[PDB]
Structure 1
Amino acid sequence: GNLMGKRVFSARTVISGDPNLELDQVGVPISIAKTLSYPETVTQYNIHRLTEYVR
């Protein structure tokens, strides 16, 4: 119950297909994207963009 499988940066809602999305995409509700994050280390390639995203 707790080891071979646990609840885990995850989200779930209702699906409805969209005929204008590349096969491999998956439209995510803004709401959700504004909730789930991603630890990206600061690097002189993305500092500029990150300092913006942060502001």
Structure 2
Amino acid sequence: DNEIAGQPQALQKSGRPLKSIRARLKGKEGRLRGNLMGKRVDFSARTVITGDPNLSLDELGVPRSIAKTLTYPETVTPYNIYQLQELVRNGPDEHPGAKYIIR
């Protein structure tokens, strides 16, 4: 407890509290409400929205720029092998393509 209400100081560099362990826990500006409650995450993205009158309701226009960077693993079914392969042979720079192959 850098400052246990006693007037210690705990100055390490330029007379500034010494980052204690209790500081990280209940910051804020740290865990608790930043590393345990609301965590960033991955496989996501965002951008400006626009209108379109021509999509079904449950439809969402996804720009290729993003589609070319997501996923979305998907195990190899015996139903896919042929279909799924075409994707790889295509490339990760061609929409109908892929990135990474897991073994």
TM-score bin (small chain): over 0.9
In structure 1, what is the equivalent of residue 40 of structure 2?
A: 7
Question: Alignment partner for residue 49 of structure 1, among 70, 74, 83?
Answer: 83
Q: Which runs of 4+ in 1 moved over 2 A?
A: none
CA distance in 2, matches of 1:51, 1:2: 39
More strand, by proportion: 1
- Give the structure-1-normalised TM-score: 0.93
Query: What one-letter code is carried by the residue in structure 2 that aligns with 1:54?
Result: V
- Can you list the C-alpha shifts for 1:29-54, whole angstroms capped at 9, x where unaligned? 00000000211101111111110001
Aligned residues between the structures: 55
CA distance in 1, matches of 2:51, 2:36: 34
Structure 2 runs not aligned, ≥5 long: 1-33, 90-103
- Give the structure-2-normalised TM-score: 0.52
Query: What one-letter code is carried by the residue in structure 1 that aligns with 2:44?
Result: S
CA distance in 2, matches of 1:18, 1:48: 35
Coordinate RMSD, CA, aligned: 0.7
Greater RCO (Cα-Cα under 8 Å, separation 6 or more): 1
| Within-5 A mapping of 1:30-49 | 30-49=64-83
